[PDB]
């Protein structure tokens, strides 16, 4: 079930093949509760480059 840490985000990144950015999620406090609320600007603020950002947004917006 949903908890306030990072496990669901990590599983999502693994599926999307973007585990290298889990570090960015942790430093930017993009915890599991933020996942459905993520925005391009929030991801850009965590220093994630454009094409990876858009892969993640497309996913959390439609899934």
Author numbering: 191 to 253
Which statements did the authors publish about this structure?
Crystals of the Gly241Glu mutant were obtained but from different crystallization conditions, after trials using the crystallization conditions identified for WT and Asp235Ala failed to produce diffraction quality crystals, suggesting a different packing to the WT SAM domain and to the Asp235Ala mutant. The structure was determined and refined to 1.89 Å resolution. Two molecules are present in the asymmetric unit and the polar intermolecular contacts between the two monomers were notably absent. Specifically, the close approach of the monomers for the WT protein due to the presence of a glycine at position 241, leading to a hydrogen bond between the main chain nitrogen of Gly241 and the main chain oxygen of Gly218 on the neighboring molecule is not possible when the glycine is replaced with a longer glutamate side chain (in the Gly241Glu mutant). The Gly241Glu protein eluted entirely in the monomeric form, supporting our observations from the crystal structure that this mutation disrupts the ability of the protein to oligomerize entirely. We determined that the oligomerization of the Tric1 SAM domain may play a role in protein function whereby mutation of Gly241 introducing a larger side chain at this position disrupted the oligomer and resulted in the loss of RNA binding capability.
The protein adopts a characteristic fold consisting of a 5-alpha-helical bundle.
